[PDB]
Write a protein that holds these residues in place. Structure first.
Motif, PDB file in Angstrom:
ATOM      1  N   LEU A   1      -8.862 -13.938 -31.503  1.00  0.00           N
ATOM      2  CA  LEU A   1      -9.091 -15.210 -30.840  1.00  0.00           C
ATOM      3  C   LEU A   1     -10.599 -15.326 -30.523  1.00  0.00           C
ATOM      4  N   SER A   2     -11.091 -16.570 -30.536  1.00  0.00           N
ATOM      5  CA  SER A   2     -12.487 -16.885 -30.250  1.00  0.00           C
ATOM      6  C   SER A   2     -12.501 -18.223 -29.530  1.00  0.00           C
ATOM      7  N   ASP A   3     -13.573 -18.466 -28.798  1.00  0.00           N
ATOM      8  CA  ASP A   3     -13.801 -19.771 -28.217  1.00  0.00           C
ATOM      9  C   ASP A   3     -14.923 -20.505 -28.975  1.00  0.00           C
ATOM     10  N   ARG A   4     -15.326 -20.005 -30.131  1.00  0.00           N
ATOM     11  CA  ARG A   4     -16.400 -20.617 -30.953  1.00  0.00           C
ATOM     12  C   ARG A   4     -15.710 -21.300 -32.113  1.00  0.00           C
ATOM     13  N   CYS A   5     -15.331 -22.548 -31.866  1.00  0.00           N
ATOM     14  CA  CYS A   5     -14.464 -23.308 -32.758  1.00  0.00           C
ATOM     15  C   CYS A   5     -15.054 -24.665 -33.166  1.00  0.00           C
TER      16      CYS A   5
ATOM     17  N   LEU B   1      -8.081 -19.218 -33.824  1.00  0.00           N
ATOM     18  CA  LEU B   1      -7.953 -18.003 -34.604  1.00  0.00           C
ATOM     19  C   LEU B   1      -9.111 -17.890 -35.601  1.00  0.00           C
ATOM     20  N   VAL B   2      -9.664 -16.692 -35.629  1.00  0.00           N
ATOM     21  CA  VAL B   2     -10.699 -16.363 -36.599  1.00  0.00           C
ATOM     22  C   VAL B   2     -10.411 -15.064 -37.308  1.00  0.00           C
ATOM     23  N   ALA B   3     -10.706 -15.044 -38.593  1.00  0.00           N
ATOM     24  CA  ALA B   3     -10.584 -13.834 -39.396  1.00  0.00           C
ATOM     25  C   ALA B   3     -11.980 -13.267 -39.526  1.00  0.00           C
ATOM     26  N   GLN B   4     -12.097 -11.945 -39.578  1.00  0.00           N
ATOM     27  CA  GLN B   4     -13.382 -11.301 -39.565  1.00  0.00           C
ATOM     28  C   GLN B   4     -13.371 -10.047 -40.442  1.00  0.00           C
ATOM     29  N   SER B   5     -14.508  -9.758 -41.057  1.00  0.00           N
ATOM     30  CA  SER B   5     -14.653  -8.509 -41.772  1.00  0.00           C
ATOM     31  C   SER B   5     -15.327  -7.484 -40.853  1.00  0.00           C
TER      32      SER B   5
ATOM     33  N   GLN C   1     -18.660 -10.770 -40.314  1.00  0.00           N
ATOM     34  CA  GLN C   1     -18.640 -12.092 -40.914  1.00  0.00           C
ATOM     35  C   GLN C   1     -17.316 -12.760 -40.535  1.00  0.00           C
ATOM     36  N   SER C   2     -17.362 -14.039 -40.118  1.00  0.00           N
ATOM     37  CA  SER C   2     -16.217 -14.827 -39.729  1.00  0.00           C
ATOM     38  C   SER C   2     -15.828 -15.740 -40.881  1.00  0.00           C
ATOM     39  N   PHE C   3     -14.559 -16.049 -40.969  1.00  0.00           N
ATOM     40  CA  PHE C   3     -14.020 -16.945 -41.976  1.00  0.00           C
ATOM     41  C   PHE C   3     -13.288 -18.093 -41.314  1.00  0.00           C
TER      42      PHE C   3
END
Ligand SMILES: C[As](C)(=O)[O-]
Ligand SMILES: C[As](C)(=O)[O-]
Lengths: 103, 102, 103, 102
Positions: free
Chosen positions: C99-103, C48-52, C56-58
Motif C-alpha cells: 500500500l502507498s499514499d502516492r497515487c 496498491l503498488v507493485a515494486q521490484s 521501481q514502482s509499477f
C-alpha cells in the motif's frame, strides 16, 4: 517432406530431485516424432537430447515408453513425455529437442 | 541410504505490512523412502536452494510433510512454502533435506 | 497483530497490451487485504503498488472492485485481482505488492 | 484510431529435422476494435517483440485472427505462434500489429 524424423517438442513442467549428496533440476517436454520419409527408419541407435543455444546437451532422465520405439513406419507418429536434467539450472535453458546417435 | 525428495516449482508471492515484508516460493514436494527400513526425519529439515547456493527457510508446510519418520517404501506429499525478506527465494529451484537445522 | 493492513499477493498471468504507438507488458496478481488492527482503517487516500527489489514502482492498470473499498473493518478481509504494467519487461520483476499514499 | 491487441504468453516449443530447427512461442491474442468504424487489417501483420526490440515472424495462426477487417466494437481471438531459428523468440513479451509486412 524431408527423408528424416521430425521432432516436435513443447516445454512442460520444471522440477527437481534430491537424494543424499545428489541434486538435479528437471525440465519436462511433450515430444512427437513424425517419420516424414517414404521408408521405415530405425531409431535403435538414436536417443532424444535436449540442448541449449550454446550447444550444451542435457541427459534424458526418464521417458515414456511410446518414445522408445525401435523404428518409425513411413508417415507415422508417436508421442509422449521426456524429462531432461542438469545439476544446476542449465536445463531450464534447454530450447531444442533433437535426435542424436551419441547415447 | 537417504530419503528421495521430488519437487515441482509452484506459486510466487509476497506479504507486506507497512515496511515489513517477505517473498514466498511454493513447491509441491513428495518424500519417498526407497530404502528397506524406516528413516528418521526428526533432525532433518526441508530447505529450498538456488543454483547459486543460497538456502531458504521453510515458512509454512502441509502437515503431511512433518512426519518424524518414513516407513520403508512409503511416501508423503504436500505443499511447502519457503521465504526470504528480499526476492532471492524466487530463484530457488531445488528442495532438499538438510541435517543443518536450527 | 499489527495496527495496519496486511497485503498478501500471489503472482498470476503475464500479458501485454498494444494500441497504436503505445505498448505495455502486464503482470497480474491476486491480492488479499487483511485489517489486523482492532479499529476500522480508511483506504481512501491509499492505492496498491507493485515494486521490484530496486525500488521501481509499477502503475496499476486495472483492479477488481472488491479491492477499491473505502475502509476495512477490524478483523475483515477483501480480495481480488490487480494488474500492473510497464512499457518494457520490468513489471515481470515486480516481487512485492504494498500500500502507498502516492497515487 | 487503432485496433487494440491483447495477448497472453503461452507455450514455448521447438521443431527439429536433422540440423534444421526453429523455436516457437505461442500467445493467445484478442484484437478489439474500440473505434466507431471498420478498420482494415489487410496491410497489417501480427508481430511478437522482445523488450530489447527484436521482432518475430508469425509461423502459424488461428483463422479467426486472419480477418481482413474488424467491425466497430468487434473482437476476434485465437492463438498465434511466432518463431525464430535460435531461441530469441522465447524473449518475446508483446504482440502488436505492424504496418511493415513483407
Ligand atoms: C549429445 As550431441 C549429438 O548434441 O553432441
Ligand atoms: C509509489 As511509492 C510510495 O513505492 O514510492
Amino acid at each position: 517432406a524431408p527423408d528424416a524424423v521430425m521432432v516436435f517438442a513443447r516445454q512442460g513442467d520444471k522440477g527437481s530431485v534430491s537424494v543424499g549428496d545428489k541434486h538435479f533440476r528437471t525440465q519436462a517436454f511433450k515430444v512427437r516424432l513424425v517419420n516424414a520419409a517414404k521408408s521405415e527408419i530405425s531409431l535403435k541407435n538414436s536417443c532424444l537430447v535436449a540442448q541449449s543455444a550454446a550447444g550444451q546437451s542435457f541427459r534424458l532422465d526418464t521417458v515414456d515408453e511410446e518414445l522408445t520405439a525401435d523404428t518409425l513406419k513411413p508417415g507415422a507418429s508417436v508421442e509422449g513425455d521426456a524429462i531432461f536434467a542438469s545439476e544446476d539450472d542449465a536445463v531450464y535453458g534447454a530450447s531444442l529437442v533433437r535426435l542424436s546417435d551419441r547415447c
